[PDB]
Structures are given as C-alpha cells and as structure tokens.
Amino acid sequence: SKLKYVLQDARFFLIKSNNHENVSLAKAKGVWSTLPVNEKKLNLAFRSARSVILIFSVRESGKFQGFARLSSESHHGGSPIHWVLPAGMSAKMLGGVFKIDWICRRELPFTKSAHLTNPWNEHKPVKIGRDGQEIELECGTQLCLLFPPDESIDLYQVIHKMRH
Amino acid sequence: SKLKYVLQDARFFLIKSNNHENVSLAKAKGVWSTLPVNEKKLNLAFRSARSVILIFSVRESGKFQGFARLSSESHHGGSPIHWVLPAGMSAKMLGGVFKIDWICRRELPFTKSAHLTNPWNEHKPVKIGRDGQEIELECGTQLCLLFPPDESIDLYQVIHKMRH
Amino acid sequence: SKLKYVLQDARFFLIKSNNHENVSLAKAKGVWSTLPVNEKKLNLAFRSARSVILIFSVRESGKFQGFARLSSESHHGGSPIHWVLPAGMSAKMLGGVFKIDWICRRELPFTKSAHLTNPWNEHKPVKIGRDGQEIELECGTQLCLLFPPDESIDLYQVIHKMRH
Amino acid sequence: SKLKYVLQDARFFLIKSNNHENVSLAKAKGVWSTLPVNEKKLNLAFRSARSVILIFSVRESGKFQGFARLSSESHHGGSPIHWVLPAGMSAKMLGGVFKIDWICRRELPFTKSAHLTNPWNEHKPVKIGRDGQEIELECGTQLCLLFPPDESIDLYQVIHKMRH
Numbered sequence A, B, C, D: 001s002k003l004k005y006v007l008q009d010a011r012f013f014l015i016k017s018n019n020h021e022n023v024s025l026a027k028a029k030g031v032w033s034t035l036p037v038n039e040k041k042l043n044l045a046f047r048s049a050r051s052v053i054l055i056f057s058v059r060e061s062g063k064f065q066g067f068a069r070l071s072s073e074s075h076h077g078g079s080p081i082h083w084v085l086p087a088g089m090s091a092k093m094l095g096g097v098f099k100i101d102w103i104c105r106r107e108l109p110f111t112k113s114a115h116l117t118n119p120w121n122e123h124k125p126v127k128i129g130r131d132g133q134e135i136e137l138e139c140g141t142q143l144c145l146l147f148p149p150d151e152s153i154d155l156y157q158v159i160h161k162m163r164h
C-alpha cells in the first residue's frame, strides 16, 4: 500500500545510462544530473505532477537497476561528482543536480517485464525506449510493482519528503 | 540611502554581452541566463551573500547599461527567449533562468568610471575584465553609485524581494 | 586473403551506438561523425596507422552490425545527415564527417565471439567496452575474420582506396 | 600589386575575438580554431572561393589587428594551443585547426575605416558586425588596402601557398 501511495498519479520516465558507474553513484549519493534540455523537462514535470518516478536501466545490462522519486527541482550541487560521461563530452555541459529519493535499489531483469507494453511507445515492451521515454501511468505502476520489495529502504522517509 | 541599503555587503560581477539584444531582453523580461558552469557559480554566490549584483556592459559600446540584483537561484524558465547566442553555439547549451530585479536601467559611459580601479583585477580600471570578473566590495559600491538614479525603478520593490 | 591484406597492421576501435538508425545511415551513406574530441582521436589514428577499422555494435542488440575502414580524415560533410542524437544534445556540437569504406555489413552475434578476449581491456570478452575502446591487433583481426563474408562488398574497391 | 593579386575574387569575414590573447596566439602560430558550426562554414568557403580572408578585431580595442588568408581546410591540429575560451565553455567543444597565412599583422584603427560601409550589412560602417559577418568584395578589398604594408611578411610565401 505504501508503494502504491507513492506511485499514485505519478509520471514515469525511463532513464538509460551507458554504464553502471553513474547508477551506482546515484544510489550512493541520492542525486542525478543530465544535460540542460533534459533538466528543464524534468523540472517542469516535477512541478506539474504529484510524483515523478525515474526508472533506471544500464544499457547492455538486460535489467532495470531500481527506481526513485524526484525529490525537488535541480540545484547547483556540491563538489564535482565523477560521473562517467560519454566519449568526448565535457562535464561543463551538465546542468544542475536533482536530489532523488530511492524507492527500490534492487534489480529487475527484462525477462520479468516482458508482458508489459507502453501505450505511449507504440505498445512496445516497456524495456524498449530512448533515454527519457515516458511510460503511461498504469504501465509504469505495474512495472514498479514488479520489482522486489527493498527492505533497505524506508518508504516513510520517501513519503515524508513528498510535498503534494 | 535606499540604493546603499541594497548594496550593503553585496558581491558584484561584471557581465559582458557581445550584443545589445541580450541586455534589452533582460531589461524587458527581468531574467538572465548563461552556460551551466557560470550558472553554478552565480547560484553559489546567491546563497552565500546578502546580495549579488550583476553590472552589465555590451562589448564595443563603451558603456555600462545598468545593474540588477539576483532575485533567486536559477529555474527551468518559461517559453524560449530569443537570446542572440555567439556564432555556432546551440541554445541547448544554456542553463536555467535567473530572475533579476533591476536597480538601474540607465547607462553609464566608461569615461565616468575611469577613476575607479578593481583591487581584485590588479587595480585595472573597473571597465576592464573578462566576463564574470568579480568587483571588490567598495569598488563595486562606488561604481553603482556613479549611475544616474533611475526614476522608472521603485527600489522598495527591490528591497521587498530581498530575503536576507 | 583480401580481408587479411586490408587488416594488416590495422588499429581497431569498438564503436557503440545507442540506436540502430545511426548505423543504418552509416551503411547507406558510407559516412560517420561524432564529437570533436573523438574526431581528433580518429584523425590522429588515421594519419599514422596503415588502416583504422571501426567495428560497430548497437547497444542492447547483442550483435556487432559490421565493420568498416576509415577512408579519409574528417571533412565538412556535404549533404545533411539526420543522425539520431542523445537526448538534449545538439547537432551543432558534432564535428566533421568521415568517409568510411564498409568491409562487412552483415551482423555477428556476441555468442560467436565468446572466445575472444581483448588484452587491452583487461582480458574482458571483446564485446565489452566503452565507446571507442581500442582492440589489440590480433584480437581485432580474429574478430573481423569471424564475420560472414559479405558478397555485396567488393574488397578491391576497399583496397584501391588505401593510400599506404 | 601583390596584395591585390591575393585579394582577387576573395571572400572576407570579420572575426571578432573577446580577448587579445587568441589573436596573439594566431599571429605567433599561424593557426585559428572555432566551434564546429563555424568551422563547417569556413571549410565550405575555403573550398569554393579563390581566397578566404579573415580580418580580425578584438572587441573594445577600437582597431583591426590584422588579416590573413585561410591556407587549408581544418585538420586535427597537432601541438596544443592554450586558447582563451568564453567563460564556462570547454576546449572540448572546439573543432579542428585552420592553417592561416598572415598578410598583415599590423593594426588599423577604426577611425581610418570610417568611410567604408558594408553593403552586405545594411551599409553600416565595416567595423560593425557580429562575429563572422561577411564583407562585400570591394569593401573588403579596400579595407585590406588601408592597412599599413607589413614588411615582416613575404607576400610571395602567401602567394606560393595558393592552389587556385
């Protein structure tokens, strides 16, 4: 029930990382960053929706690595984070830093989501999509409910940080 | 006295634009933008100082065009603004949008500031500096006091938006 | 023998694309592009090595899609190419265009290269690597020899464009 | 006569730098660089025009610092060049390096060109223009002829590098 409360009326985005290190840093530090165009879209979504849920997948892994709620709009951030940037990209191109509240840090293999389709991506399987693909409400809710419950996470701390 | 109150313990930055259009848009809309690296520095300065004052100069103009107080940290912004970007730069590289409260929208020719030197730039005349050059407290205060008073601006509205 | 001739003393790079579209365009038009940092690295490699071989893999495909020889240093480009760019990145950030001479446009599944490890990447299977990972001479040679012969390609045309 | 020969049928571009350092480096090393969008435009102009002439002006200097002929399309570069970059921009964003053949390294004050208007920029004085502004043939020719002869330059070396 607590997870479903967190997910009520949420918007869902599929976030694809080229490597494991960025998702590991996000789990360790509770933060996320991206290019300004995407940052703008996330900030708009954050102000417009009861919750914004990021569902993370490392390409070539065949799995989702967890999901998290946007905790606030982006801000300047602290000391540099050693993100692993795509070949040739300068860290000077990154925007601000989002604080994220992890709801599940456990993995879900794509084999377990093979029955779900995203109406907002031509009913392709929900694993399929470009970085930032939005997942329709009911599909995104079912996908999140497929993850194993994460006993290392206190959903009350997630619920307390909600300001809807 | 009101202007001096606004300037108390402020930090001052010299902001140089390649063209008039960006400063005109900033006066019309009460906003400013820049690349993320600079945005980060302005956001940090905003949280650290009683006031952050931007002093604007259009290159090749021989003048300052006015000065404004940072009103808040940067945010996603509204509809695109038709900023005039340097040749070859994508608007996708810009960070968020700062709201600024204009304190003076009138010009000051460089000839009138020729007696002031910036200790934080090797005592070069205060007109001299790369974009973002910081101006020492007393020098920056004297420079702002050289501008003609702007009767079109209500300093009470500036003072009311201060949250120190 | 013709393939082994082209590959003599070659340098090999694993090129990872996040979508099929860019590799399909490269196959149709015989060109490639990327960010200026990587463009510089490819131009340096082209000028010094007898051949530079790009081995392409679309992430999440579980296959290599083919491989090609760099035919020239990068140049202006000519006609526009509707590359698919990472979210939030501008085509204005891209460097010039390389002419590439395809050697094989047929696919090779990762299962077929399970016995090849790359000694310049910690002896990990050669399918593993960040974008641009260099592959040691003998490992890259054997990987290219694993691809099925591509009758649609005239290796004499590839060989005749060599200027060693 | 030698100068008029070099300038026959040339295209002329006004290049505006925000600091003296970049123009000083260009004069010392005989090279130029810029963002890929502008690099593409310069490479196109080089391939089609008999000569491409870059006329340099450091903003706020009130002078042109000299002019040079594009000697080649852009290339990798070679040795590093410690260009001064706009605040917040990364050297990784820059394109390749153009070889330039200086024709005059002596300065021309704007007061000396007050009679030349650029018909491809609304008949504004030729000193006026955004970075990269193209200058009509006869106006650019007369502007270059206004510079003082530069005995330190051997125009035969410039002429011998022409490949029209």
Ligand SMILES: O=C(Nc1ccc(-c2cncs2)cc1)c1cc(C(=O)c2ccccc2C(F)(F)F)c[nH]1
Residues within 6 Å of the ligand: A013, A015, A016, A017, A018, A019, A022, A032, A033, A034, A035, A038, A039, A041, A042, A083, A084, A085, A086, A094, A131, A132, A133, C087
């Ligand atoms: O946040 C990401 N992407 C996104 C795309 C679109 C949209 C939206 C579009 N429309 C509505 S939301 C939202 C987010 C996004 C980030 C990464 C990283 O690996 C990463 C992480 C941190 C720093 C640097 C990087 C790195 F530079 F390496 F990329 C992959 N993805």
Ligand SMILES: O=C(Nc1ccc(-c2cncs2)cc1)c1cc(C(=O)c2ccccc2C(F)(F)F)c[nH]1
Residues within 6 Å of the ligand: B013, B015, B016, B017, B018, B019, B022, B032, B033, B034, B035, B038, B039, B041, B042, B083, B084, B085, B086, B094, B131, B132, B133, D087
């Ligand atoms: O804000 C600017 N620069 C800055 C530099 C350094 C620092 C700091 C460094 N350290 C502490 S603060 C702060 C601000 C800055 C902006 C401009 C513009 O013309 C402009 C305006 C709006 C949109 C796009 C642009 C455009 F893209 F065209 F540039 C010039 N300047």
Ligand SMILES: O=C(Nc1ccc(-c2cncs2)cc1)c1cc(C(=O)c2ccccc2C(F)(F)F)c[nH]1
Residues within 6 Å of the ligand: A087, C013, C015, C016, C017, C018, C019, C022, C032, C033, C034, C035, C038, C039, C041, C042, C045, C083, C084, C085, C086, C094, C131, C132, C133
């Ligand atoms: O060329 C690429 N990468 C590379 C990295 C490192 C090195 C080297 C490092 N050291 C020696 S070589 C060489 C090449 C590279 C390109 C892509 C694309 O999908 C692509 C294709 C065309 C246009 C735009 C893009 C897009 F913008 F979408 F990316 C993925 N990869």
Ligand SMILES: O=C(Nc1ccc(-c2cncs2)cc1)c1cc(C(=O)c2ccccc2C(F)(F)F)c[nH]1
Residues within 6 Å of the ligand: B087, D013, D015, D016, D017, D018, D019, D022, D032, D033, D034, D035, D038, D039, D041, D042, D045, D083, D084, D085, D086, D094, D131, D132, D133
């Ligand atoms: O080359 C430049 N601009 C250009 C604009 C448009 C066009 C054309 C448009 N249409 C046909 S040609 C051609 C050239 C241009 C370069 C600079 C620099 O100071 C500079 C120099 C070297 C490295 C880095 C920089 C720095 F990063 F600092 F900028 C100013 N300007």
